[PDB]
Design a protein around this ligand. Sequence first.
Ligand code: HEC
Ligand code: HEC
Ligand code: HEC
Ligand code: HEC
Ligand code: HEC
Ligand code: HEC
Ligand code: FES
Ligand code: FES
Lengths: 423, 423, 181, 181, 235, 235
Amino acid sequence: SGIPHDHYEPKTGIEKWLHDRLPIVGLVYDTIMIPTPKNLNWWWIWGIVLAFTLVLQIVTGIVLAMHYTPHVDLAFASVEHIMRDVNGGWAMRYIHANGASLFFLAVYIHIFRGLYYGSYKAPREITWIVGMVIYLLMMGTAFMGYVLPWGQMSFWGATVITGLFGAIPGIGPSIQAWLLGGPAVDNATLNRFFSLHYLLPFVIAALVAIHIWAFHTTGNNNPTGVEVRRTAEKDTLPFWPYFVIKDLFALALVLLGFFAVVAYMPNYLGHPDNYVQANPLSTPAHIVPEWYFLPFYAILRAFAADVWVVILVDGLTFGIVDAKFFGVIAMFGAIAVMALAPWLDTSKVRSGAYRPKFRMWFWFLVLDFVVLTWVGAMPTEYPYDWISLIASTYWFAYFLVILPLLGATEKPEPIPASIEEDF
Amino acid sequence: SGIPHDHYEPKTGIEKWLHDRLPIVGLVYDTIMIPTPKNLNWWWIWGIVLAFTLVLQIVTGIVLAMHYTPHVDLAFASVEHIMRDVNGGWAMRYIHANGASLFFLAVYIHIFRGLYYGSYKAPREITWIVGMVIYLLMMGTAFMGYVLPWGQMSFWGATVITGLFGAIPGIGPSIQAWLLGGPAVDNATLNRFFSLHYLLPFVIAALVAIHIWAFHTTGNNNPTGVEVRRTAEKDTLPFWPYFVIKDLFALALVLLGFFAVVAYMPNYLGHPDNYVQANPLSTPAHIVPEWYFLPFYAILRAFAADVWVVILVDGLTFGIVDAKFFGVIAMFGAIAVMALAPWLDTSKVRSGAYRPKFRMWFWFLVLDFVVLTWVGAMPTEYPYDWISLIASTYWFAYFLVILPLLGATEKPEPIPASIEEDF
Amino acid sequence: RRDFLYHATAATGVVVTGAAVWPLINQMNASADVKAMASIFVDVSAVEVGTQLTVKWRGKPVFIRRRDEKDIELARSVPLGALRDTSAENANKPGAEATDENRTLPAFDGTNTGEWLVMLGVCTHLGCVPMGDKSGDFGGWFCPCHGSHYDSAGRIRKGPAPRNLDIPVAAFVDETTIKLG
Amino acid sequence: RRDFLYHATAATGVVVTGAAVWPLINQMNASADVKAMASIFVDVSAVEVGTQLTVKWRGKPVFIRRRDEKDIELARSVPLGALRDTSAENANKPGAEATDENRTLPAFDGTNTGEWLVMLGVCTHLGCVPMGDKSGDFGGWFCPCHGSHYDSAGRIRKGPAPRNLDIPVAAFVDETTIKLG
Amino acid sequence: PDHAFSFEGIFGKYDQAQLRRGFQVYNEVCSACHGMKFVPIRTLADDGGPQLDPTFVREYAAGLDTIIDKDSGEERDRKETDMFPTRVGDGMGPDLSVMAKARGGPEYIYNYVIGFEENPECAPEGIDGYYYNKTFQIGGVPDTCKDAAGVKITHGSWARMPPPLVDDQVTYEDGTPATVDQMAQDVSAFLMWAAEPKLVARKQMGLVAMVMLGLLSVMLYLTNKRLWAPYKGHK
Amino acid sequence: PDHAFSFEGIFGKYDQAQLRRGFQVYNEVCSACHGMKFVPIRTLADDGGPQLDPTFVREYAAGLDTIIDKDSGEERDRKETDMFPTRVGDGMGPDLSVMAKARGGPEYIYNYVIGFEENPECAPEGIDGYYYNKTFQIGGVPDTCKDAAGVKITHGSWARMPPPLVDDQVTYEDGTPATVDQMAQDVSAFLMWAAEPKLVARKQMGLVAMVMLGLLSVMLYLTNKRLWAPYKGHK
Ligand code: HEC
Ligand code: HEC
Ligand code: HEC
Ligand code: HEC
Ligand code: HEC
Ligand code: HEC
Ligand code: FES
Ligand code: FES
């Protein structure tokens, strides 16, 4: 059971004088020969993808910062200095910019893999909490970063996603001014964002430290509602070399596609308007902040008192909870409820591979995510308003009511024993 | 023996559900209730001082970077923006600038405490190696940082301490150009230095991580040549609360003095010429890089073929080893030999509190350090040249020959037993 | 005493910690160079009355637009009913009803109001810049960030934007100038 | 085979790693905005030989002045004695004596030296720009910052300036050009 | 058909004669109003695009406007190391440095320059000082051409730029019919250069990397198939 | 004796009348050649120094040179938010923003302005265009005054600045003998302000912190003496 196999430091004198600093003991006993089940599909790779992508982003950023100059008058020029003069330039920038896209794409699949195979269910709450914390940090990071080029979309995205904090009453304008460094956006905001943007990744790495510490102490989830049967465990092959090699193969494929993009379709995920300098006096059409924030942008700009299911007219009971504040609360709740999940699913069961109704609702949820992604880009004119309202309502409904009802009446399936599934 | 007292997680349900992430187990069992001897004097505090100073510098720097603009045309102006407009300004800058001084002062006492009480002697080699690595990183950091204000001393200090790398043959100019971003100093160097200067502290923290991991696995030296007698150990009180409180008291005193300086004598340790903008066309008198690099500056500018003990005329046997290269090697060796110490002292003994000849030689070494500090500022005219040569020669002599001879014939003392020294 | 001394040491440590932390949170507030926040003299100087005039100030645009009769009549023909924000955000006067008589502007040092209207070109939703030059579904301004329709006098309509376009404190400089601040 | 396949996978991984690392070490090299600086040329092209020619480079001026016979004879008639700096600061050659034969310049790709002299227009005292066009008490250059008198060939005289006007590395481009760098 | 360019694909390293033609046009036509500050003059020798002769570059630079200085205010000689000039206002337009990316890009410029036909049969009078363009979409439209809810019934809108070229505005030294269409294509390619000069290097890097990573991935697949063999043989 | 200032010590928050006098002196004498770019004009209302009336500040600002703009080249009215002007060259000197720190500082300025006496009895002819000072140390010296190895035998050296003031150059509105010495002291204090405006806040922070930390340290000493009591009582 949970064989650590510390190696007893019996190799030789080198492995015996290393009794001063244990380090190799840690690596070997724990982070390399960690028994993992055999039943792992191709959905348990994306964590390696995320770690590598994080390293990539940190490196490329440390390189760019050697040529980026945070200032309204010299940011655009420095970015062009990069893409033209520097030796590698375009590569670093395109790899930095697009890799953010892959990062978020990979976390999406990392998260939805989790929702299916009960990875939030006990005893794996801490991992979930830490993951939501990370998600928040990395969203804030990417936001701070999209601003640095001082293009045109930078300015206005910052403007609105800071007016949010100002929507709330009493302490809105104060926070807004304390965050922007002033009444509106200017170089001060740029300096804050650069610093902050150059600091959070390390916090993320530490949090990834705790993320990795947790699921090593707590066994990796597995396609089944079963554990490694610790009591000797013919199942649960080790990590190295088997799963290391599997993950590296998938990672090679992913990097292949990523570099093909970088080299042929690099400006595809971007907004052309970010290639024109900023004008605080003129706003372009369809700001469309980005593609990894459209869901929440839509959940925000949906509630506007423009439907018979408009709960804003009812929330107006209290004269303080206006629309804006309502949408902001709705977004914060869209995330808080995803974090609260493990204490809402009242099921003494596990992976939805043995819960059909859950399968249907979950695929509807994935569809809802895609729809929200597609709607945040389209105007607030009919019919898109009804669509956004329906989708947000279903998100909240799933995460609040649907899981309890299932946990109550959702066991028409024969659960599998013997995690050694030699089929 | 080595009582970890993991606490068994018996407190309550909170301390039992924390079996998902061990964290509190680590803290309690290891990093708080770490048995430390009773025989500790006031020289075992400076590590807490260093940790706090590092945190202070990191914080103040993260704040400054919100107003510093890396560019030749806007650095000085941004520094003045800080010292005038910003709310706190002068405080952050003076605390950042002077705290570097305290940092190095504290590492000096941290290191010399070590040389006395055989802290480099086995089984504490890894700590020593890691400490020298750190010292290097933090020297490079402070150097990169003194440049950012783009004053006058910045430029020329950078110029010379980069011409060093160019002294060596074959691969000197290439490295020089690859480091400066060009033939000479300009904005590119500034960007590199800012980035680098804003990144190494985290590496230092990690290295401090390993530094703290090592001497927790390996027992803290103790005033004597004795261990905690693991086999139950009435000696070796714990760290918390006793030594925590002692160190915090000393730290309060140190911060008191430090803030008195910051508020009354802040520009004392500085060079006034760093308050005039840079002129690549005019060099001031007595550049005098700083005060924590004068020893090595002197060891460098001492060997010049101007004494009957001039080994440069002899090293000229090989036409490649000229003077400059000789001084550079001499400096790198001045540090490498300090790192090699633990394998040069051929003594099966410990703290020099029981080795008189070692006491005398060690106090001579401290005097040599002070002298080198005082000489790097004075010209290379007679008699200072002879002084610098003598001092460097003694440094090397100590660390190479003196310790072996002692280890041979240096045991006229009764060593103390029973680390419980109830005198 | 054990309890008193220990707890008092802890309290003093906490107080000192807070006194040290506050400035790290104060420096990010508005510096003195941002404290200034003073006024601007914009000269109308034959702007070809009826199209628009925009000027930068405080980091935001200040819209100075003359009036077109059709725009005017549409304005003056708006009863307070069915008007989202009836507060006349203009800070040059009290919270008087959002009426065109009060909402247009001072009268050149003369006596007339239905000819000029200078408001802050900042959408009250989240601070975007609406497009002018007769746009939207009400013959006024249209915000492209989320779709908020403004009217002729600038009062919000048909969108999430809660209130109309504010009006800063401004007076005239004797028939060719505007004072913003 | 076990050995072949395993070792080959390792080799390929290493190769890819190195191909990815090299640029990380390449970006720190001279960017394009800096290369166009190391090599700067100056088309003399009939500068009306005898008065002067100044060009900006490296942030400092590079003086290219033809020779006037009276200036020349005054130069060639200066014995090394009574010459503050006799090192011929010119870096296009060794520390040979500060003589006009070595100190004037290369010979157009031909054979002559007493006709052109291009030096760095930067006073060695503290970096001011001396005034040219026959000035001072020696028929050369005069520094107005502290009063340093230069001679015809640029060697320092009558002032605090310790050394003469340096001469950068420069060669000719076949009778109408100068290469500075 | 769509008149695809050379670079439109996995290959097509910027046929350079096209770019020299676009340069002949840009400096003689578009430069009167437009600028390219984000473009150094020393790039007309760098590989990939117009590999002109440096000496001609220095000549053409000295023949341009006067960019004064950064240290000592004095009208210099506009050395190549400086950037192209900037036309800012009073009847002038934006900067074309990266206009090929702020819009499939070059096709916009081609189909924009192409198309300035007379005013349609809804508002033949048109507007004073504004001219009509088939493809610009961000211009004003008269009320006579708008529908019942503000949308325009015209394909394009009214742009403040006049027609830049006639039937035979300039001569090509290489020898080529200099009609409007060829000039439009050429200048579009020149602007795409000014925006993406490092295109060919992009493509070559992409090829090299695709190849090396396909190789690595194949080898890893073989290694995986091997290691996992004794566990996937009986089923 | 040494004519210590007010701020020379643990107290001395910049007696303000002295600074107003120095301002009368600086704008009417030193401003002709010198500048203080690193100094905003609005600081003449901030506490600590001359707490002048804002309206007078706006007047004095509009009465200065013309600082054109940063966005649209046009000679503006020079609002207080801008900085003091800059005199750069052609018989002009450096910037006095922080000259009180680039040298005990203000004593240098006092003992420099003080001292321009005639040429000594080693070189009475002197120099054309240069004038003599007894304290500047970074100026040229004639060969007649140097020793055998280049060192000067004079106390000071020759500075390019002329004597700035005579016996009674300006009047003080408050009522005070405006001799040269008082003006020198006043202007020195004004420059020290221009360099260290946040001095008094520095001192008050130092006091507060010394006090709080002495308190904390005393309490920690008591706690230590207590905890370590049962182990240091028998010896
Ligand atoms: C003045 C006589 C011009 C000359 C000659 C050229 N251009 Fe221009 N251009 C000019 C103006 C005033 C504008 C703004 C138009 C508006 O309505 O805002 C433009 C615009 C362009 C654009 C941008 C179009 C867009 O979608 O915003 C392009 C791509 C453009 N012009 C191209 C172009 C070329 C290639 C020219 C030389 C052949 C050229 N223009 C000449 C003014 C003038
Ligand atoms: C021109 C007529 C001047 C006026 C009036 C004032 N100053 Fe000046 N100053 C001037 C020059 C050309 C120089 C450079 C002198 C040199 O030899 O380089 C200076 C210098 C100073 C300095 C710096 C001295 C030093 O050690 O470098 C100071 C402190 C100074 N001047 C002060 C000063 C004051 C207070 C004035 C008004 C009372 C003043 N100067 C007027 C030119 C001129
Ligand atoms: C060491 C510095 C650094 C790190 C670490 C870093 N970046 Fe950046 N980032 C930059 C710089 C510099 C820019 C501006 C240059 C650019 O846009 O490429 C930038 C810009 C961006 C952009 C906008 C790209 C563009 O071209 O508009 C995004 C998105 C972004 N960062 C996201 C991230 C995310 C997400 C992470 C990690 C979680 C990250 N970055 C890590 C330095 C860094
Ligand atoms: C909001 C949720 C969430 C986020 C965001 C998240 N994780 Fe996870 N992660 C999980 C969960 C749940 C598991 C499953 C743990 C288990 O099975 O015991 C997991 C597992 C892992 C694993 C091991 C198994 C696997 O799925 O590969 C790795 C490695 C990992 N995460 C890395 C990362 C990294 C690196 C990041 C970010 C840079 C990240 N994760 C972000 C929740 C998250
Ligand atoms: C987050 C950024 C950051 C960190 C971390 C940081 N500094 Fe700095 N440092 C700066 C900035 C910004 C400046 C320039 C402003 C200044 O000089 O105060 C600077 C300047 C300096 C200076 C010159 C001070 C002066 O005023 O001339 C020194 C010395 C220095 N740093 C040393 C260090 C050392 C040693 C460390 C830690 C080992 C450190 N710094 C940590 C940001 C930082
Ligand atoms: C070059 C040598 C060196 C450097 C530099 C160094 N250390 Fe140490 N450190 C030592 C040695 C040796 C010991 C003694 C370990 C033992 O007694 O087991 C030690 C002990 C310590 C201790 C515990 C006992 C004590 O002396 O306080 C702390 C805490 C510590 N170091 C922190 C730091 C920090 C933080 C830094 C830098 C930011 C640092 N040290 C730099 C060598 C070094
Ligand atoms: S920001 Fe103006 S409507 Fe959303
Ligand atoms: S600077 Fe040239 S002589 Fe003083």
